[PDB]
Write a protein that binds this ligand. Structure first.
Ligand SMILES: CCOC(=O)c1[nH]c(C)c2c1CCCC2=O
Length: 109
């Protein structure tokens, strides 16, 4: 059931937003503020920005046909972070910790 697997996707996103993961998930909660100092080049590098609130809205608006499409947006959000930032940036390590949560849940769904 595609409906049931999308309910699992909503459960994975709910955990990613949970207090347990907040110490490293918070940079991914909302769209990157491209007007902040140091982010003048974000829009030139990142063609398709993505964040957890936009994914939550896409789930609510039924913009994902299946778990594969939901997973693609979660992975786009982490890939944007890895592409934009230097490999030693604090946010890259936070993205890895959050991706560990996602990949384990997504694989076992
Ligand atoms: C202080 C507020 O910065 C953020 O929440 C935030 N989130 C992500 C994913 C990023 C940033 C800033 C650096 C670029 C980046 O990849």
């Amino acid at each position: 059931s595609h409906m049931e697997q999308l309910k699992c996707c909503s459960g994975i996103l709910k955990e990613m937003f949970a207090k347990k993961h907040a110490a490293y998930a918070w940079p991914f909660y909302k769209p990157v503020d491209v007007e902040a100092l140091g982010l003048h080049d974000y829009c030139d590098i990142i063609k398709h920005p993505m964040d957890m609130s936009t994914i939550k809205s896409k789930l609510e608006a039924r913009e994902y046909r299946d778990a594969q499409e939901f997973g693609a947006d979660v992975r786009l959000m982490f890939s944007n972070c890895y592409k934009y930032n230097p490999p030693d940036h604090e946010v890259v390590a936070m993205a890895r910790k959050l991706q560990d949560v996602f990949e384990m849940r997504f694989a076992k769904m």
